Structures are given as C-alpha cells and as structure tokens.
C-alpha cells in the first residue's frame, strides 16, 4: 500500500512555504534558512513500521510509525505533537494535534514526482520532491 512512496527524495519545487512557517509561529532567522534549504526526505519500511528521516543542512528530523496508530512527534519547529499517518485516497496523510491546532502533511504521487501539501490555518504549502536513485 506505501511502496511507490519509499526510497530517497529531494526537493525540486517550493510554494508557500515561508507562510506555513510563519502560520506556525517560526521566527524570520529560521525561515530565511528554510526558504534556502532543499531537504533530502528518505522514506522506508520494514514490515508495519515506516521510518521517515528530513535531512538537510539545517535542520534533520526522524520519526518513525505504524500506519493509523498515534505517535508522539517533536517538529523540527520543536512543536511537540501527536501525530498519525495514515493512506487516504492514495495519499499519504500526516495528521499533528498539538494545542487544540492542527496542521496536515499530506504527500501524493504525480507523474512520478512526490507532491507534499502542508496545511495550518489558512496557509497552503506545495513542496515537490523527486526520486532519487
Ligand atoms: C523549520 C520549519 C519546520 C516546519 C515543519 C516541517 C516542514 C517539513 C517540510 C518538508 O518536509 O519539506
């Protein structure tokens, strides 16, 4: 159900990105590097649990999750969260609870390449991924 999902990613394509940053509070020093940072996101299985590594000159993150069970999450931002992933559609549905706030990571396969949508408040980010072999 997750496999063309997995293997190594690299950003190609941003929008919006410095406002879903600025929607969840994150100071101008860290988004200006943010906005010059192309993460390397690298998604693999072994059986039910899926570990997904962000990997970049500034910041790296790592979770690791079973489909459809809550984990807890520590945001690069240093939001402390709970978190479920989850296929939706396809799509694979990242869902964070922190607050009483929400905010959705939801990556899609398009010709090939991995669309990530990032949703918080009213702030719509579309980043674009695309394999590497
Ligand atoms: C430093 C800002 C962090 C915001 C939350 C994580 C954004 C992930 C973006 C990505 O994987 O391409």
Redesign the pocket.
Known sequence: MVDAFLGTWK?VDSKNFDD??KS?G?GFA?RQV?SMTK?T?IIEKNGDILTLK?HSTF?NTEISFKLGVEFDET???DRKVKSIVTLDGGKLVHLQKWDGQETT?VRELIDGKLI?T?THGTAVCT?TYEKEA
């Open positions: 950003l879903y940053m969840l994150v860290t943010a993460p996101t962000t910041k945001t690069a931002d990571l990530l990032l980043r």
